[PDB]
């Protein structure tokens, strides 16, 4: 049982923090959105007036923030307030470049730091079944594990600082490509007169199977739990996929990589996000009909 400062108490940070409180940690919260902070307080987070004050007597500091810029500014504001050798865990989704920069910044201030972005969304966060993809030192992850556990269904060490962000962004790029491809297949099948149930049964029993079909089937019927059956309510929103793909495109640009389908998927989701940000990312199927 350690004292944890938790900066960012929003859609993800609120249920994350609640699980920490439930596990017996003292959680010192800050969020400049008083609605967020109030909700967190209701579940036992001690809310502070400023981030520096929340971090001042914390063994661990978790950030769950919107962007790399917001992480960078938060770190600049709070690192000097924290006790030397405090463990910073950033569970935001941010660029590999930004993660590496904030890691170095934390370390130059005498703090341990990991990137530990997650997958599972709000449902995963509430149920404590998130996946944490961690970058940093193995020994620092060893020190973090007892804090991550009450939030996690899986903790995977991906490599050195930034590798957690990297693994997540690579997976998500692939996921976006698969979701569009699966959508293209279902619409082609429809036009060829092949039934959606029939195509589902084939692909899921064959080499094309993947989560985008078996779990996120973009036509109503074959997977009654998929968003297609609930008006494309997220699920994993187009807004969030578009964010993650922007981060993938930042990684492609920073490395000089060639990612033709991943970049094409990014273009497709950027356009689709202009008007359908609020729909599950499987809703992209709409653009292929009508």
Ligand X SMILES: NC(=O)c1ccc[n+]([C@@H]2O[C@H](COP(=O)([O-])OP(=O)(O)OC[C@H]3O[C@@H](n4cnc5c(N)ncnc54)[C@H](O)[C@@H]3O)[C@@H](O)[C@H]2O)c1
Ligand Y SMILES: C[C@@H](CCC(=O)O)C(=O)O
Rg (CA), the chain: 20
Of positions 46, 126, 170, 277, contacts its own copies by CB under 8 A: 170
Region near ligand Y per CB under 6 A, out of 152-160, 181-189, 209-217, 271-279: 152-160
Query: Residues 203-238, buried b or exposed e (16+ Cβ, 10 A)?
Result: beeeeeebebbeebbbbeebbeebbbeeebebbbbb
Tokens of 12: 């993800």
d(CA 45, CA 65): 17
The answer to whether 83 touches 129, Cβ cutoff 8 Å, is no
Q: Which of the choices ligand X, ligand Y, its own copies, none does residue 93 contact, using the CB cut-off of 5 to 8 A by kind?
A: ligand X
Interface of this chain with its own copies, residues 221 to 260, rule: CB under 8 A: 248, 251-252, 255-260
Does position 131 bind ligand Y by CB under 6 A? yes
CB neighbours (10 Å) of residue 21?
19
Does position 12 bind ligand X by CB under 6 A? yes
Q: Give the H or E element holding residue 240.
A: helix 238-255
d(CA 49, CA 113): 24
> Is 60 part of any known ligand binding site?
no
The answer to whether 121 touches 236, Cβ cutoff 8 Å, is yes
Tokens of 183: 């959508």
Between 64 and 199, name the residue whose CB sits nearer to ligand X: 64
Region near ligand Y per CB under 6 A, out of 50-58, 147-155, 167-175, 220-228: 147-155
Does position 270 bind its own copies by CB under 8 A? no
Of positions 22, 34, 50, 66, contacts ligand X by CB under 6 A: 66
Of positions 212, 223, 266, 273, contacts its own copies by CB under 8 A: 212
Between 125 and 144, name the residue whose CB sits nearer to ligand X: 125
d(CA 210, CA 119): 17
> Is 209 part of any known ligand binding site?
no
The answer to whether 242 touches 173, Cβ cutoff 8 Å, is no
Between 88 and 132, name the residue whose CB sits nearer to ligand Y: 132
Region near ligand Y per CB under 6 A, out of 31-39, 106-114, 126-134, 135-143: 126-134
Binding positions for ligand Y, rule: CB under 6 A: 120, 128-129, 131, 149-150, 152-155, 205
Binding positions for ligand X, rule: CB under 6 A: 7-13, 30-33, 36, 51, 64-66, 70, 74, 92-93, 118-119, 121-122, 240, 243
């Amino acid at each position: 049982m350690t004292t944890i400062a938790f900066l960012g108490l929003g859609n993800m940070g609120a249920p994350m923090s609640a699980n920490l409180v439930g596990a017996g940690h003292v959680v010192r919260g800050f969020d400049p959105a008083p609605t967020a902070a109030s909700g967190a307080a209701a579940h036992g987070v001690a809310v502070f007036r400023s981030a520096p004050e929340a971090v001042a007597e914390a063994d661990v500091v978790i950030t769950m923030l919107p962007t790399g810029e917001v992480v960078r500014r938060c770190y600049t504001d709070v690192l000097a307030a924290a006790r030397p050798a405090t463990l910073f865990i950033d569970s935001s989704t941010i660029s590999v470049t930004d993660a590496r920069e904030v890691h170095a910044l934390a370390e130059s201030h005498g703090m341990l730091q990991l990137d530990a972005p997650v997958s599972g969304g709000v449902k995963g966060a509430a149920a404590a079944t998130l996946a944490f993809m961690v970058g940093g030192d193995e020994s620092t992850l060893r020190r973090a594990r007892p804090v991550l556990e009450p939030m996690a269904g899986k903790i995977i060490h991906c490599g050195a600082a930034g590798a957690g962000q990297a693994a997540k962004v690579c997976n998500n790029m692939v996921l976006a490509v698969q979701q569009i491809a699966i959508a293209e297949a279902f619409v082609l099948a429809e036009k060829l007169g092949l039934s959606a149930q029939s195509l589902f049964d084939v692909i899921t029993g064959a080499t094309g199977n993947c989560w985008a079909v078996h779990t996120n089937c973009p036509v109503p019927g074959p997977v009654p739990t998929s968003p297609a059956n609930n008006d494309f309510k997220p699920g994993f929103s187009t807004a969030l996929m578009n964010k993650d793909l922007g981060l993938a495109m930042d990684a492609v640009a920073a490395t000089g990589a060639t990612a033709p389908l991943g970049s094409h998927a990014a273009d497709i989701y950027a356009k689709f996000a202009a008007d359908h940000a609020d729909l599950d990312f499987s809703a992209v199927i709409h653009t292929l009909r009508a």
